[model samples]
Target: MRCIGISNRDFVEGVSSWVDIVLEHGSCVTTMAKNKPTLDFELIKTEAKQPATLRKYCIEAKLTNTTTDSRCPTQGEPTLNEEQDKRFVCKHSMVDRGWGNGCGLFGKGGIVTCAMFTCKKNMEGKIVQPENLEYTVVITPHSGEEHAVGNDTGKHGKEVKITPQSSITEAELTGYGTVTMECSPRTGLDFNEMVLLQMKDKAWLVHRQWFLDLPLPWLPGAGSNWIQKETLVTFKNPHAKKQDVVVLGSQEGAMHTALTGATEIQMSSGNLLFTGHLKCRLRMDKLQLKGMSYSMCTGKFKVVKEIAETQHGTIVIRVQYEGDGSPCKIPFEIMDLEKRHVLGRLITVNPIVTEKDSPVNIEAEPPFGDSYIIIGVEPGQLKLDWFKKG
Candidate 1:
């Protein structure tokens, strides 16, 4: 007899669908209190008028006799117990769709650690799980501290360990390339975290970022298990002018690049950016360089002199741009002189239109940057009140 099993992506996708169903119901029990407001565990337990079992969809949960140690209730004081004038402690657990065929376990189901919480009041009637609970999901929680850091300074004294811990390597073409990372920690990590890539030399400017998804552990009726899985990461160059970028870190990295003929990366352990031909053709119509836009007519610029080289070995070139039309923009496309292939495109942030096109002078250099995938969960608290069917 022959048998087949779903791939990890397919398996996790099923889990994701189930999670979506649970989330749609808007019940604390189903989502394990994820994204829900932090409960005033101490206060809720003290004022809880009664214990009851709440069920929505495939999950069943009941009020517990014990309360959690979480005391951070950031909600307004009156809002907490105003609804029911009472409270209750609840313990909820699921074998995640109940240990059956869907979970891949014929009979033995893997146990999802139960999530417990205390709720503030409710119900003349029954346990009301809101189908659409309205609450703000704050990422960092504290005010004024948006993003924590903008630039990636390698010299920082471990202020805070950033996500998608990655490393950079020189590219095969002319500039620095792909930012690679591996090893997502088991604790305090979730799927679909953003990895930010920054330029090391350019004051650690943010260049590009990617999202990461981790493979769910195949827990077979178990306590805990550790294993590493592989995920195929395909980076589609938003620019179609260049051939697919090459990868060159791992043993099979080069072969994978050659075979795929696309920037499809097979990510396993350490995060790495495989830099292949990094040249691209910039749109001549929308050309902007050194924060200044040139005229509208087609023209070319010549490198006048080598201004300076940064400590990181970046040689800055000065060029004079002259075009025919009125004030327009300046675009850059690094190319291979002999092969006539556009190596890559260089884009600047916000640029201003020059006063008049009198051969504007500007500095040009090969841009070097980093790439990282920030991986972390969106921290949030859910605000739940007894379902009041209006």
Candidate 2:
């Protein structure tokens, strides 16, 4: 049998010789080596084990309002009616893999191009509106990597197209406007990953519609013009998970409390009760509380409570309150609040009720008004015991 073996040093020396020969020819050899024909046969043989191919892409867009209509036609001219006509302009640009670092290299390759903007005002001494608007850039790689980068590329290298159909809205002035760009990508590429780039000139501008005269909610016959603007960016990250439901609420002048046995409670003149029920498909954090009546009123009140089942079981409640109201002074009391029955123990305060002398009356009246309460039962149990019973 014939045996053949190659040492590591021999393999290394052979690669170094090949590289040295290729570099000796300078630019021509370098170009030829880099541009070597693709090995289709070898690529097909081990295609399954190869890493997923990825192509990177990027695009930028911008919008500007440069037209200024002045009433004065000559120097030192003055007029009572002086107004400027606003011009809305847009431009866009895009780049793909295999192009000059404009689009990075990754997934399946693509192409990149940009728009152009030249104005007559650039030659004049007057201030230019939206000076040097920037283009928004977007990149989507075939490896499921979608991200964006800005300012690295040349300024205004690409133009964004702003169609005449686009106009500023009131919500946009209030920092809630949606600016949509009509993106056109090279043939056979997906443009859904296009992103908005931040630019000073392309920022939201307060429109006249945002300053429309309207009646004031608190002061009748009083009106003023108001405008708002905001810039925002939205992107997808793998770390965040989707939520199923969220509940938000605000607490005023009372601390959340747990009811052990029977307890009395009262409401003050300044005490206010607000309840909100929400059913959402996504999980929501705790509700934020604001504009409390405690700033104007005073008094003590009791918070409604839920009880535990076992002899030593405890229920925890979160409490946040304003002012210096005592939780013990409230006239509404909870009797037999616990689910357990004490042997040979006497229960007082049957059918807890609210007194009229209380600072605030919230108890439901008979006949026309009905009181409602909620009770929880053990899992798999159909019967729920009421706290009102002795």
Cα RMSD, each candidate:
31.6, 37.0
| Candidate 2: segments with Cα more than 4 A from true spot | 1-75, 78-222, 227-344, 348-390
lDDT of 1 at 120: 21
Tell me the tens digit of each residue's lDDT in model 2 across 1-390. 000010110100112001221100001110001111100000000001121111111111122322221111121222221111112211111212223433234222211111121121100001112112111221110010011111122221122222112321111111111112221211111112211111112211112222122111111112121111001111122222211111111111111121112111112122111111111011111111111221322233233332222111111111112224322222222223342332111011111112322222111111111112221112221222332221
* Cα lDDT of model 1 by residue, 1-390, tens digit: 000010110000112111221100011110112111111000000011232222111111222333222111221111122222232212212222223324323322222111122222111111211111111111110010111111122121111111222321111111111111111222121212311121111111011121111121111222122111111111222332111211112223222232343322223122222121111111111111232333433444433343343332222233444434444553433334342454332111111124333332221223333211111111221111111111
* Candidate 1 Cα errors over 4 Å, as ranges: 1-297, 300-308, 344-353, 357-390
TM-score of each: 0.18, 0.12
* Predicted structure 2, TM vs. truth: 0.12
Residues forming the 10-long window of minimal summed lDDT in candidate 2? 38-47
